[PDB]
Amino acid sequence: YGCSFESSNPLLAIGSLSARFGALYWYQQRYLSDHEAVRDDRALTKAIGHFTAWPDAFWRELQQMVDDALVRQTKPLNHTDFVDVFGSVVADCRQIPMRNTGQNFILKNLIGFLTDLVARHPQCRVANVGDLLLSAVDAATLLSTSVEQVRRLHHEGFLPLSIRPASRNTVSPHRAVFHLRHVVELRQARMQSHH
RNA sequence: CCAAGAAAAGGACUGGAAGAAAUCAUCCAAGUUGGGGACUAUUUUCUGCCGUAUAGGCAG
């Protein structure tokens, strides 16, 4: 009904109401997968405790699935889709309606993590994590901008395309084609703002 | 409920004999195909011991 908080240590304890609503919606689909039992009070009541160690737990949830994915590998990683390892955790960032990083704190932590992941895995002769392919709609989300802007950014040569398409065809938004390390670096280099 | 209704064309057979297509001949003269250009990339093949040895055999 209102916020009214002070000494807001948890990442769920600050902000405008729309964000506070979005954070709960996200928590629910992701951890309350059990079918509705109209436990309208009890089901959501737990979300606050959950977030109290967030700055240090979210990363472990992401780390766990890097390893479980790795041991099930069937192709060299540089032809593997980003989605096969992280399971659309990126798309879920779109459920909070705000676009910028300083307000959408879920996206802010996911990017933090991916930047570190790339940093500890530099390029060498054998491919490794960080060379995964992103689709056009994924870069748009990580770069905090609409899709048409990515097409314009490609056209000017600020980033490379890795898969050669056939002639008399087009690459659709859903096709996986940019390397992760290329997107992370470009964003640090030329996409920052006061937000 | 048809110019309606029914229906065994069968049996036999020696085309033969003979022949010279031939003589002649000039396809020639001329002619500008040319101008430009990346097979390597997100490659997988490293590190050692024995053996005179770029031979031959081996662990990871």
> Among positive and negative, which fits the CA dihedral A186, A121, A161, A114?
negative
As a whole number of angstroms, the distance between CA A186 and CA A175 comes to: 20
Exposure pattern of A42-62 as b/e (b: 16+ CB <10 Å)?
Answer: eeeeebeeebeeeeeebbeeb
Quoted resolution (Å): 3.5
- In whole angstroms, B47 C1' to A14 CA is 56
| Residues of chain A (11-30) having a beta carbon less than 7 angstroms from strand B | none
Strand partners, A81: A133
CB atoms within 10 A of CB A12: 21
Which nt has its C1' nearest the CA of A123?
B42
What technique was this entry resolved by?
cryo-EM
Q: From residue A102, how far is each of A5, A19, A59, A144, A166 by CA, in Å?
A: 19, 12, 19, 11, 41
| Residues of chain A (143-182) having a beta carbon less than 7 angstroms from strand B | 162, 179, 181-182
Q: At what angle do helices A180-190 and A105-119 cross, to 10 degrees?
A: 110
Q: Is the CB of A76 under 7 A from strand B?
A: yes
A138 Rama sector, left if φ>0, alpha if ψ -120 to 50, beta otherwise:
alpha
